Design a protein around this ligand. Sequence first.
Ligand SMILES: [Zn+2]
Length: 53
Amino acid sequence: MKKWVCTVCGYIYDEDAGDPDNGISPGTKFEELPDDWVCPLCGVGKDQFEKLE
Ligand SMILES: [Zn+2]
């Protein structure tokens, strides 16, 4: 699946990994993250992530 980078702190959201400690199963597409999911390291919102190319 795809990866997305936090443009504030560099955290990589990996769709294959999800973010299960924060309620996000492995395989959750970025688009389907809840609207108020935030970077698990710096706390910024989804708008600050860029999809890896
Ligand atoms: Zn971050």
